[PDB]
Amino acid sequence: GKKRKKKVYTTPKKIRHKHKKVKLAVLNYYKVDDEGKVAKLRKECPNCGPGIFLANHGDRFYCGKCHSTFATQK
């Protein structure tokens, strides 16, 4: 015989982290200069290949491909 009581938590709650949706985060990556030359914001990764922009955050370029390998202080 085994009769367990209803579980009681000494913890308010911890909900799954709903990931932060950004409304048109693509536009912050590029900037067209008067229907012509396009400029990249932030930075770029030389490893993956051109295109992947490097996150700014706290003085450490955080790429998307080399998430672990590339956090380059600048």
Partner 1 sequence: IEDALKVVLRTSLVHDGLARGLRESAKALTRGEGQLAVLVESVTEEAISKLVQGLATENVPLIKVADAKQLGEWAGLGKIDRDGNARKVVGASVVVVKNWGADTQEREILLEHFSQQ
Choosing among Zn ion, partner 1, none, which partner's interface includes residue 26 (Cβ < 5 to 8 Å by kind)? partner 1
User: Looking at residue 72, what DSSP letter applies?
Assistant: E
Nearer to Zn ion, 31 or 46 (CB): 46
Nearer to Zn ion, 40 or 65 (CB): 65
Nearer to Zn ion, 31 or 65 (CB): 65
CB 31 within 8 A of CB 38: yes
CB 46 within 8 A of CB 54: no
Closest distance to partner 1 from the beta carbon of 39 (Å): 9
Fill in the amino acid letter for 42: R
Q: Residue 30: beta bridge partners?
A: 40
Which of 2, 6, 11, 35 touches partner 1 by CB under 8 A? 35
